[PDB]
C-alpha cells in the first residue's frame with residue numbers, strides 16, 4: 001500500500017496526490033511529472049519503473065543529457081486531474097515572463113528511495129506551481145487533511161513556502177481563505193520555539209504555530225533533512241504533526257480549536273492547490289518538495305501514523321549533487337573559458353566584479369592571483385564547493401541579483417547559500433559546469449566577459465540561450481598563483 005491507499009482505507013481519500021519521486025498509489029503506473037530541456041524545448045514524461053514504484057530517473061538523465069531541464073508539470077496520481085503547472089501572477093508578480101513564477105530545475109534535489117535514484121523539486125525564491133481549478137478539494141468549512149515530505153534544511157523567512165488549500169483567484173481574499181502546510185522560519189506572523197524552521201498552517205493573513213496569533217511554544221523547530229509535515233483542518237479544529245520522514249513517529253505540535261479570531265471559524269477555503277508560494281502568489285520563499293497529498297475528510301491520527309511509517313519505509317536518502325571533474329578542498333585552481341573565440345581567457349575579477357580576462361605567464365602577480373581560486377568545502381552544502389579569492393582571502397564568489405561578485409564571507413546563511421556551487425560534467429563536454437546550489441537552474445556563465453548566475457534562457461539579457469552550453473563549460477587547470 002502507498003500513502004493514498006492507507007488514506008482510502010481510513011475513509012479520507014486523496015483528492016490530489018503529487019510526487020516526482022514515487023507513486024503514491026500501489027497500482028499507479030502513469031506519468032509522475034513532465035520535463036522540458038532548454039536544448040529544443042521538447043518535453044517528455046517520467047513514470048514509475050513499475051506500478052507503485054520509484055521514478056525512472058535514468059530517463060530524465062537520458063533526456064536532459066548535455067542540456068538543462070525544468071519540471072513543467074507534477075501530475076496528480078489521484079485521477080482528479082489536479083496536476084500542478086506553472087504558477088500565475090496574483091497579488092504579486094513572479095520573476096518569470098508576464099508575471100509567472102519560475103519552474104524549478106529537475107536536478108536540484110537528487111535523492112534515492114530505498115537505493116533507487118530519483119529527483120525532488122528544489123524550489124528557489126520566485127518558483128511556484130499551482131492549480132486554481134481543482135476537483136474534490138475541500139471548500140467552505142469542509143474537513144481535509146494533507147502531508148508533504150520536505151527538506152528540513154532548505155528554506156528561508158520570506159513568505160511563503162506552502163503546499164495546501166488556497167484561493168482560486170490567486171489573491172488574498174481574507175482570513176480563512178486558506179489551509180496549506182508551511183515550513184520556514186518567517187516570523188512576520190506566527191512562529192515557534194527555537195531558531196526554526198517550523199511547520200505552520202497558512203490560514204490566510206496568518207501562519208499559525210498554534211492557537212494564539214504570533215508566538216506559540218508548542219510548535220518546535222523541526223530541521224531534519226527529510227521532514228514529514230501532516231496538517232488537517234475541520235469544523236473549529238485543526239492540527240500540526242511533524243516527524244523525521246527518515247525514521248520514527250509523527251509528533252503532535254498542535255491539536256484543537258481554530259485560532260479564536262474573526263474569519264477563521266467557520267473556514268472559507270476556496271479549493272485551489274499551491275506549492276512553494278503563498279495564496280496571493282508571494283514568491284520569496286524556498287524549499288524542497290518530494291511527495292505530498294491532500295485529502296477529503298479529517299484523517300484519524302492512526303491513518304497518519306501509517307502514512308508516516310510507509311514514508312520511513314520509502315527510505316529517503318540524500319543523493320549525489322556532483323558529477324564531472326570536481327575538486328578537493330584546499331585545491332587552488334584556474335578556470336578557463338571554452339567558448340570558441342574566448343579560449344584564452346580565465347575567470348578572474350577586478351575588485352568585486354567577476355569577469356573573464358586574458359591571463360598568461362607575462363601577466364602580473366596581481367592578475368595571476370585574481371585569476372586563481374582556492375576551492376573550499378561548499379559553504380552551504382558539504383557535497384559542493386565555494387570559491388575563495390587567492391588575492392583577496394576571506395572573500396568568495398557569490399551571486400547577487402544573479403551577478404557573480406567577489407564579496408567577503410559575512411558568516412550568514414544568505415552569503416553561504418549565494419556562494420555554494422555544485423560541479424556538473426560540462427554541458428559542452430569540456431571541463432565542468434558550475435551549477436548554483438540555491439538556484440539549480442543557474443550556472444556560472446560568461447556574457448560579454450562578465451560572470452553571471454545564468455539560466456539557459458530567461459528574463460535577463462545574460463540568460464541568453466545563444467552559446468549557453470559553451471558559456472557554462474570551464475576547464476579546470478593549474479592555478480596561475482602557483
Ligand SMILES: *[C@@H]1O[C@H](CO)[C@@H](O[C@@H]2O[C@H](CO)[C@@H](O)[C@H](O)[C@H]2NC(C)=O)[C@H](O)[C@H]1NC(C)=O
Nearest residue numbers: 156157185186187188195196410411412413414
Ligand atoms: C531565519 O534564520 C536565519 C538563520 O539563523 C536568520 O538569519 C541571520 O539573519 C540576521 C538578520 O539578517 C543576521 O544578523 C545574522 O547574522 C544571520 N545569521 C545567520 C546564521 O544567517 C534570520 O534572521 C531568521 N529570520 C527571522 C525572521 O527570524
Ligand SMILES: OC[C@@H]1O[C@@H](OC[C@@H]2O[C@@H](O)[C@H](O)[C@H]2O)[C@H](O)[C@H]1O
Nearest residue numbers: 284399400401402403414418438453
Ligand atoms: O542572486 C539573487 C539574489 O540577489 C540578492 O538579493 C536581492 C534582493 O531580492 C529582492 O527582495 C530585492 O530585489 C533585493 O533587495 C541575494 O543576495 C541573492 O541571493
Ligand SMILES: OC[C@@H]1O[C@@H](OC[C@@H]2O[C@@H](O)[C@H](O)[C@H]2O)[C@H](O)[C@H]1O
Nearest residue numbers: 339342446447448449450466467471
Ligand atoms: O562573454 C563573451 C560572449 O559574450 C556573449 O556574446 C556577445 C555577442 O557576440 C557578438 O555577436 C557581439 O559582439 C555580441 O552581441 C556570449 O554569450 C559570450 O560567449
